[PDB]
């Protein structure tokens, strides 16, 4: 009834022409199709509703749109909104409807490469912003944060489904590994926003927190190697452990020599010194990533990337506050494409329409297991209940590696021809896709308010 | 003998360490392989001495290197050097040695697309720098400059080889068209350097000169359509003329509507207004180019591109002096790749090792025919002998379209199966490749000195 009067009042408010912002938004929504038509003239049907690049660009577009609408018109009366949830939900819903997803068939290799490169930006962003002084005294503490809660959560889920879903004693380790991971891609943004809030950085807290997600994935994939070699009987399991350990040692060793120069002698009076260094370190990051992938040790890339980024940042300490701006303005566009690619994977009906409410428990309890074990990791270090519960709230998000190696177990079961392992694989695919959908974004939603609640800020 | 003492003296001069510039050059020569390794990890052997992208990047590298060495250590005691000559000679010499060119097999489609996009930058650079006041009174004069000398040069070569090499009366038009073209890609740089010299711009001369190379190529290709339809008996020749005329009318018509907005209401208080507008107009340029290519009217692209670039520039008149900087810093890298691509086409022995010194005359005389006909185009307009001979020296360079449609006649003769037309095609391929190798760069070499010699500059 009153909606008509409200619309008339809005039309009257727009009668005083806000032609400025209107023209801005019109130009924004009008520019879009430029590169679409460009690459269409380049390749033809590749940019049509039957083409790969068309699907890629429309995925990116619906991803950048879906994120803003999630926090555009409403707020659940206290907080703002986690746009990244909508950014990933876009690709998810595109995947859900196949009768229209049949125009978004993205090249699997290319899509995976995009997913693997998108994380490098958040990696280098984390590496530069680090501070060594506060961490140097807390090294072992952060190691405990990075190791404890995930391993205990993993074995918790392993034994939970060992009892309920019947995992053998030598195979539930796979469920452990697929549960053990971290997604700093959403964490680092929250850490930087709270750094802008100046709350935790009074102890450097946010920089210390996001620096922890380094080796948990490597332990998960090392265990994955050896557990495939044992249960899946794939090759030498002791050599699988060797493979998983060597990818740690090389990733921590080879990353140092880059800082030996870029921290010391990237000569100062170079014209585009910062403008060079930026894409230089991005190239070195993706180089480490994909060279290690080619070698078969993808975990080694992030380690060398992070240590190199921190090393140069220590040398760039003056100018590192300027290279960050280019990385920031670039990083805006690589979030939603990554989130949509992770979302555009599978649908619920293919996993199971039933037994959903009776199988989620093995991960649902593990979520809680991680929380207070994070609290326990701080044995004697000084943090009050507010600080410790804030730390506990931080280590929760896990979305990235669950998508990275989720269905690979079922794929391996198919490739090797093991029907019992194939039912195992459909189940682990189920639990893997469950371990992504809500974990990270609902965990990062709270940070923007728990910062003010538990941390302190200068006047 | 004294070379040893000279080297010892140079070593003594370097004993006082110039470590700054040395480190700069070391970093420069060291950075190179970054993207090579990146795209190698992306595609593998595509970045090896058997891959396409490898050949592309090494072409670009030898092109950027060969240009600087051409003017690095010596000067022919008066002038500086035309780097672009070396930039193109690099690709030429890579093409010449096949036993090593067999690692540089570039995708023909991709290479042609690069050659076609590289010109768009010089196009938009020409469009923005134009001034309408001086040209508005000289419109017909510039039309005469653009039409007269090339047509007379074309029919000159046509009848020359009609007599000497035996061209029929209805077929030498092909030789005319392949002789009638222009290469502003080298001209506009000279015009902008002399504008910086402030010599001709006291009458706006350099801006007026480079604006002439617009329609000569279109007339050449229209005649090409109808002459193929007549001599090569390919389709309706009257419809070939219709095709050649419609590509003029649409290219001059459709380019206006873009300026109707971008000259008037790309709202001022947009954040990246210039940073947007730049790649916006680049996209519109390449869009016109390749959409017209898809339609089959490639000449229409440059027209819409140029009129749109000038229109917005008129509106950007204040800020157009700022968008130019991004286009300038970008244009540095697209020159040498284009020049190498044009160079990497064919070798002399495949055309003819003999009859060279007895067949060049038909174009060698035509070179001179163009010169004084350019002088004659200025019927009554006021320009002294120095100004008129400067104008005559300007219209000379022709390198682009000769490479664009040179061998296409021989290819057509092969496709249609006409052996007499195939010998015709090897001969026109010969004369086409002759009409590129020295024409433009030796013609632009002189401008940097003829400016001071014939033009005037403020104190």
Curated annotation (Swiss-Prot), chains A, B:
Changing residue 216 to G: Abolishes Na(+) Li(+)/H(+) antiporter activity. Does not affect plasma membrane localization. Na(+) binds at residues 182, 213, 216-217. Residues 43-51, 100-109, 166-171, 229-238, 296-299, 350-355, 412-424 are extracellular. Changing residue 370 to E: Abolishes Na(+) Li(+)/H(+) antiporter activity. Shifts the specificity from Na(+) to Li(+). Decreases plasma membrane localization. Partially retained in the ER. Allosterically inhibited by the N-terminal domain. Inhibited by phloretin. It is found in: Cell membrane; Mitochondrion membrane; Endosome membrane; Recycling endosome membrane. It is a multi-pass membrane protein. One of its GO terms (biological process) is sodium ion transport. Its main location: membrane. InterPro entries: Cation/H_exchanger_TM, CPA1_transporter, Na+/solute_symporter_sf. Signal peptide: none annotated. Changing residue 178 to L: Does not affect plasma membrane localization. Change in the substrate specificity with a preference for Li(+) over Na(+). Residues 72-82, 128-138, 181-208, 263-277, 312-328, 379-399 are cytoplasmic. Changing residue 370 to Q: Does not affect plasma membrane localization. Decreases the substrate specificity for Li(+). It catalyses: Li(+)(out) + H(+)(in) = Li(+)(in) + H(+)(out); Li(+)(in) + Na(+)(out) = Li(+)(out) + Na(+)(in); Na(+)(in) + H(+)(out) = Na(+)(out) + H(+)(in). Keywords: Antiport, Cell membrane, Cell projection, Cilium, Cytoplasmic vesicle, Endosome, Flagellum, Hydrogen ion transport, Ion transport, Membrane, Mitochondrion, Phosphoprotein, Sodium, Sodium transport, Synapse, Transmembrane, Transmembrane helix, Transport. One of its GO terms (molecular function) is sodium:proton antiporter activity. Changing residue 184 to T: Does not affect plasma membrane localization. Less sensitive to phloretin inhibition. Homodimer. Dimerization is essential for SLC9B2 activity. Lipids seem to play a role in the stabilization of the dimerization subdomain. Belongs to the monovalent cation:proton antiporter 1 (CPA1) transporter (TC 2.A.36) family. The subcellular localization of SLC9B2 remains controversial. Was initially thought to partially localize to mitochondria. However SLC9B2 does not seem to contain a mitochondrial targeting sequence. It was later established that its localizes predominantly in plasma membrane or intracellularly to endosomes and lysosomes. In another recent study, endogenous SLC9B2 in the distal tubular cell line mpkDCT4 is detected in recycling endosomes but absent in plasma membrane. Electroneutral Na(+) Li(+)/H(+) antiporter that extrudes Na(+) or Li(+) in exchange for external protons across the membrane. Uses the proton gradient/membrane potential to extrude sodium. Contributes to the regulation of intracellular pH and sodium homeostasis. Also able to mediate Na(+)/Li(+) antiporter activity in kidney. May play a physiological role in renal tubular function and blood pressure homeostasis. Plays an important role for insulin secretion and clathrin-mediated endocytosis in beta-cells. Involved in sperm motility and fertility. This is Sodium/hydrogen exchanger 9B2. It comes from Homo sapiens (Human).
């Amino acid at each position: 009834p009153t909606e008509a009067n409200h619309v008339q009042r809005l039309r009257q408010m727009l009668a005083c022409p806000p032609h400025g912002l209107l023209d801005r938004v019109i130009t924004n929504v009008t520019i879009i199709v430029l590169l679409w038509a460009v690459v269409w003239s380049i390749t033809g049907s590749e940019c049509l509703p039957g083409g790969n690049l068309f699907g890629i660009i429309i995925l990116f577009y619906c991803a950048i749109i879906g994120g803003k609408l999630l926090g555009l018109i409403k707020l659940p009366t206290l907080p703002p909104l986690p746009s990244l949830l909508g950014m990933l939900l876009a690709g998810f819903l595109i995947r859900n409807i196949p009768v229209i997803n049949d125009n978004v068939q993205i090249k699997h290799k290319w899509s995976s490469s995009l997913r693997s490169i998108a994380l490098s930006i958040i990696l280098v962003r984390a590496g530069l912003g680090l501070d060594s002084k506060a961490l140097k005294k807390l090294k072992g503490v952060c190691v405990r944060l990075s190791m404890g809660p995930c391993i205990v959560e993993a074995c918790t889920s392993a034994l939970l489904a060992h009892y309920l879903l019947g995992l053998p004693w030598q195979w539930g380790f796979i469920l452990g590994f697929v549960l053990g991971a971290v997604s700093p891609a959403v964490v680092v943004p929250s850490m930087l926003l709270l750094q802008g809030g100046g709350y935790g950085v009074e102890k450097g807290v946010p920089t210390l927190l996001m620096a922890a997600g380094s080796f948990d994935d490597i332990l998960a994939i090392t265990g994955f190697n050896t557990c495939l070699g044992i249960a899946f009987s794939t090759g030498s399991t002791v050599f699988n452990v060797l493979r998983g350990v060597l990818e740690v040692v090389i990733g921590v060793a080879t990353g140092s020599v880059l800082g030996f120069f870029i921290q010391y002698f990237p000569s100062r009076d170079q014209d585009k010194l910062v403008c060079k260094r930026t894409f230089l370190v991005l190239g070195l990051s993706v180089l480490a990533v994909f060279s290690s992938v080619h070698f078969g040790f993808p975990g080694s890339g992030g380690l060398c990337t992070l240590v190199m980024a921190f090393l140069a940042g220590m040398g760039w300490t003056s100018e590192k506050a300027e290279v960050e701006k280019i990385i920031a303005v670039a990083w805006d566009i690589f979030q939603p494409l990554l989130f949509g690619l992770i979302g555009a994977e599978v649908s619920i009906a293919s996993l199971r329409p039933e037994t959903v409410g009776l199988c989620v428990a093995t991960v649902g309890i593990a979520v809680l297991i991680r929380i207070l074990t994070t609290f326990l990791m701080v044995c004697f270090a000084g943090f009050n209940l507010k600080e410790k519960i804030f730390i506990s709230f931080a280590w929760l998000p896990k979305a990235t590696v669950q998508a990275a190696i989720g269905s690979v177990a079922l794929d391996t079961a198919r490739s090797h021809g093991e029907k019992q392992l194939e039912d195992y694989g459909m189940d682990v695919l189920t639990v893997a896709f469950l371990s992504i959908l809500i974990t990270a974004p609902i965990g990062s939603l709270l940070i923007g308010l728990l910062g003010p609640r538990l941390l302190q800020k200068v006047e």
